[PDB]
Write a protein that binds this DNA or RNA. Structure first.
Lengths: 51, 48, 113
RNA sequence: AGCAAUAGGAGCUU
Protein backbone atom coordinates (compact mmCIF):
# COMPACT_ATOMS: atom_id res chain seq x y z
CA UNK A 1 0.00 0.00 0.00
CA UNK A 2 2.84 2.40 0.76
CA UNK A 3 4.72 1.97 -2.52
CA UNK A 4 2.49 0.06 -4.95
CA UNK A 5 5.41 -2.28 -5.61
CA UNK A 6 4.54 -5.95 -5.78
CA UNK A 7 5.30 -8.00 -2.70
CA UNK A 8 8.01 -10.60 -3.24
CA UNK A 9 5.85 -13.14 -1.39
CA UNK A 10 2.23 -13.97 -2.11
CA UNK A 11 -0.38 -13.46 0.59
CA UNK A 12 -3.04 -15.88 1.80
CA UNK A 13 -6.18 -13.87 1.24
CA UNK A 14 -9.92 -14.30 1.70
CA UNK A 15 -12.98 -13.92 3.92
CA UNK A 16 -13.15 -15.30 7.45
CA UNK A 17 -15.87 -15.10 10.11
CA UNK A 18 -14.63 -13.08 13.09
CA UNK A 19 -16.24 -12.35 16.45
CA UNK A 20 -16.43 -9.24 18.65
CA UNK A 21 -15.70 -10.39 22.18
CA UNK A 22 -17.01 -8.64 25.29
CA UNK A 23 -13.53 -7.69 26.52
CA UNK A 24 -12.98 -4.06 25.54
CA UNK A 25 -9.99 -2.01 26.63
CA UNK A 26 -12.27 0.84 27.72
CA UNK A 27 -13.89 -1.54 30.22
CA UNK A 28 -10.48 -2.41 31.70
CA UNK A 29 -8.30 0.69 31.63
CA UNK A 30 -7.97 1.94 35.20
CA UNK A 31 -5.62 4.34 36.94
CA UNK A 32 -5.63 5.64 40.50
CA UNK A 33 -3.64 8.46 42.07
CA UNK A 34 -5.48 8.83 45.38
CA UNK A 35 -8.97 7.83 46.35
CA UNK A 36 -11.28 6.18 48.85
CA UNK A 37 -9.78 3.86 51.45
CA UNK A 38 -11.30 1.07 53.49
CA UNK A 39 -12.83 1.92 56.84
CA UNK A 40 -11.11 -0.89 58.76
CA UNK A 41 -7.63 -1.07 57.22
CA UNK A 42 -7.41 2.46 55.72
CA UNK A 43 -5.90 0.85 52.59
CA UNK A 44 -7.00 1.55 49.01
CA UNK A 45 -10.39 0.02 48.25
CA UNK A 46 -10.80 -2.93 45.88
CA UNK A 47 -12.36 -2.52 42.46
CA UNK A 48 -12.12 -0.73 39.14
CA UNK A 49 -15.70 0.47 39.58
CA UNK A 50 -14.89 1.70 43.10
CA UNK A 51 -11.70 3.51 41.97
CA UNK B 1 -11.43 0.70 70.53
CA UNK B 2 -14.18 1.01 67.92
CA UNK B 3 -11.51 1.44 65.23
CA UNK B 4 -10.85 -2.30 65.44
CA UNK B 5 -14.62 -2.96 65.18
CA UNK B 6 -16.13 -0.04 63.27
CA UNK B 7 -19.78 0.07 62.36
CA UNK B 8 -20.98 0.41 58.76
CA UNK B 9 -23.93 1.79 56.82
CA UNK B 10 -26.12 -0.46 54.67
CA UNK B 11 -28.79 1.78 53.07
CA UNK B 12 -28.13 5.39 54.09
CA UNK B 13 -29.80 5.15 57.52
CA UNK B 14 -29.05 1.71 59.00
CA UNK B 15 -26.07 0.33 60.88
CA UNK B 16 -25.05 -3.05 62.27
CA UNK B 17 -22.18 -3.45 64.70
CA UNK B 18 -19.10 -5.49 63.85
CA UNK B 19 -18.84 -9.08 65.03
CA UNK B 20 -16.44 -8.18 67.84
CA UNK B 21 -18.96 -5.67 69.22
CA UNK B 22 -21.83 -8.16 69.38
CA UNK B 23 -19.43 -10.72 70.85
CA UNK B 24 -18.44 -8.27 73.59
CA UNK B 25 -22.13 -7.58 74.23
CA UNK B 26 -22.76 -11.32 74.60
CA UNK B 27 -19.82 -11.54 77.01
CA UNK B 28 -21.29 -8.68 79.05
CA UNK B 29 -24.66 -10.44 79.20
CA UNK B 30 -22.90 -13.60 80.38
CA UNK B 31 -20.98 -11.63 83.02
CA UNK B 32 -24.13 -10.05 84.42
CA UNK B 33 -25.88 -13.43 84.48
CA UNK B 34 -22.91 -14.74 86.48
CA UNK B 35 -23.40 -11.80 88.86
CA UNK B 36 -27.07 -12.89 89.29
CA UNK B 37 -26.18 -16.30 90.80
CA UNK B 38 -23.75 -15.58 93.64
CA UNK B 39 -26.33 -13.09 94.92
CA UNK B 40 -29.28 -15.47 95.38
CA UNK B 41 -30.41 -19.08 95.09
CA UNK B 42 -28.21 -21.12 92.76
CA UNK B 43 -28.54 -24.92 93.07
CA UNK B 44 -25.10 -25.65 91.62
CA UNK B 45 -26.53 -26.60 88.21
CA UNK B 46 -26.85 -22.97 87.15
CA UNK B 47 -23.50 -21.63 88.43
CA UNK B 48 -21.57 -24.13 86.32
CA UNK C 1 -11.66 7.89 25.46
CA UNK C 2 -8.04 8.12 24.32
CA UNK C 3 -8.75 8.27 20.58
CA UNK C 4 -7.50 11.52 18.99
CA UNK C 5 -9.56 13.30 16.36
CA UNK C 6 -9.61 12.00 12.79
CA UNK C 7 -9.12 15.53 11.41
CA UNK C 8 -5.73 16.16 13.05
CA UNK C 9 -4.28 14.20 10.11
CA UNK C 10 -4.77 17.15 7.75
CA UNK C 11 -5.75 20.30 9.69
CA UNK C 12 -2.54 22.24 10.34
CA UNK C 13 -2.49 23.97 13.73
CA UNK C 14 -1.41 27.59 13.90
CA UNK C 15 1.62 26.84 16.12
CA UNK C 16 2.82 23.89 14.00
CA UNK C 17 4.75 24.58 10.78
CA UNK C 18 4.14 22.50 7.68
CA UNK C 19 7.87 22.04 7.11
CA UNK C 20 11.04 22.28 9.21
CA UNK C 21 14.62 21.95 7.94
CA UNK C 22 17.65 20.97 10.02
CA UNK C 23 21.11 20.05 8.71
CA UNK C 24 22.80 16.69 9.11
CA UNK C 25 26.32 17.62 10.22
CA UNK C 26 27.80 14.11 9.97
CA UNK C 27 28.04 14.13 6.17
CA UNK C 28 28.65 17.23 4.02
CA UNK C 29 25.82 19.11 2.35
CA UNK C 30 22.90 17.10 3.77
CA UNK C 31 19.62 18.19 5.37
CA UNK C 32 16.83 16.58 7.38
CA UNK C 33 13.27 17.65 6.58
CA UNK C 34 10.27 16.79 8.74
CA UNK C 35 6.92 16.99 6.97
CA UNK C 36 4.08 17.32 9.44
CA UNK C 37 0.59 16.08 8.59
CA UNK C 38 1.66 14.09 5.51
CA UNK C 39 2.05 10.38 4.80
CA UNK C 40 3.40 7.92 2.23
CA UNK C 41 1.52 9.58 -0.64
CA UNK C 42 3.80 12.61 -0.83
CA UNK C 43 6.85 10.87 0.63
CA UNK C 44 7.15 8.04 -1.90
CA UNK C 45 6.43 10.34 -4.83
CA UNK C 46 9.15 12.78 -3.79
CA UNK C 47 11.62 10.03 -2.90
CA UNK C 48 11.39 8.19 -6.21
CA UNK C 49 11.49 11.48 -8.11
CA UNK C 50 14.62 12.68 -6.30
CA UNK C 51 16.38 9.30 -6.46
CA UNK C 52 16.79 9.59 -10.24
CA UNK C 53 18.75 12.84 -10.32
CA UNK C 54 22.51 12.65 -10.94
CA UNK C 55 23.31 15.29 -8.31
CA UNK C 56 21.35 13.61 -5.51
CA UNK C 57 23.57 11.21 -3.58
CA UNK C 58 21.28 10.29 -0.69
CA UNK C 59 17.48 10.50 -0.33
CA UNK C 60 15.26 8.50 2.01
CA UNK C 61 12.18 8.80 4.17
CA UNK C 62 10.49 7.09 7.09
CA UNK C 63 7.31 7.30 9.11
CA UNK C 64 8.64 6.58 12.58
CA UNK C 65 5.23 5.70 13.98
CA UNK C 66 2.02 4.85 12.08
CA UNK C 67 -0.11 6.47 14.79
CA UNK C 68 1.46 9.87 14.07
CA UNK C 69 0.88 11.55 10.71
CA UNK C 70 4.31 12.77 9.67
CA UNK C 71 7.45 11.61 7.94
CA UNK C 72 11.11 12.62 8.02
CA UNK C 73 13.35 12.75 4.97
CA UNK C 74 17.15 12.73 4.66
CA UNK C 75 18.54 14.21 1.46
CA UNK C 76 22.18 14.70 0.48
CA UNK C 77 23.56 16.23 -2.70
CA UNK C 78 26.92 16.87 -4.33
CA UNK C 79 29.23 19.78 -3.54
CA UNK C 80 27.91 22.46 -5.90
CA UNK C 81 24.22 21.58 -5.64
CA UNK C 82 22.02 22.36 -2.61
CA UNK C 83 19.45 19.76 -1.50
CA UNK C 84 16.75 22.44 -1.21
CA UNK C 85 17.05 23.51 -4.85
CA UNK C 86 16.94 19.86 -5.91
CA UNK C 87 13.80 19.47 -3.79
CA UNK C 88 12.07 22.35 -5.56
CA UNK C 89 13.28 20.93 -8.88
CA UNK C 90 11.72 17.54 -8.10
CA UNK C 91 8.46 19.15 -6.96
CA UNK C 92 8.24 21.23 -10.14
CA UNK C 93 9.02 18.20 -12.30
CA UNK C 94 6.25 16.14 -10.71
CA UNK C 95 3.84 19.07 -11.10
CA UNK C 96 4.65 19.34 -14.81
CA UNK C 97 4.29 15.59 -15.29
CA UNK C 98 0.90 15.66 -13.58
CA UNK C 99 -0.23 18.59 -15.75
CA UNK C 100 0.74 16.73 -18.92
CA UNK C 101 -0.98 13.61 -17.60
CA UNK C 102 -4.17 15.58 -16.90
CA UNK C 103 -4.17 17.22 -20.33
CA UNK C 104 -3.73 13.88 -22.08
CA UNK C 105 -6.42 12.23 -19.96
CA UNK C 106 -8.92 14.98 -20.76
CA UNK C 107 -8.20 14.84 -24.50
CA UNK C 108 -8.48 11.03 -24.45
CA UNK C 109 -11.76 11.18 -22.53
CA UNK C 110 -13.18 13.67 -25.03
CA UNK C 111 -12.06 11.48 -27.95
CA UNK C 112 -13.70 8.44 -26.32
CA UNK C 113 -17.09 10.16 -26.61
C1' A D 1 -15.96 19.46 51.40
C1' G D 2 -17.42 13.63 52.51
C1' C D 3 -19.40 7.37 47.36
C1' A D 4 -20.81 0.24 53.29
C1' A D 5 -19.91 -4.69 54.38
C1' U D 6 -20.08 -9.77 53.83
C1' A D 7 -20.97 -13.99 50.82
C1' G D 8 -22.00 -16.89 46.50
C1' G D 9 -21.77 -17.39 41.16
C1' A D 10 -19.78 -16.53 36.29
C1' G D 11 -15.61 -15.02 33.82
C1' C D 12 -9.94 -12.73 32.05
C1' U D 13 -4.53 -13.84 31.51
C1' U D 14 -0.85 -17.10 32.79
Amino acid sequence: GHTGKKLMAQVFFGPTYYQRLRHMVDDKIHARARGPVQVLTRQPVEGRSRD
Amino acid sequence: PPQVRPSIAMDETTQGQDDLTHKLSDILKANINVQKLEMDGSPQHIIN
Amino acid sequence: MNAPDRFELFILPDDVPKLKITPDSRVPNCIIIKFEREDHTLANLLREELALYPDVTFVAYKVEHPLFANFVMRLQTEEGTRPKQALERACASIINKLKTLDHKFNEEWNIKN
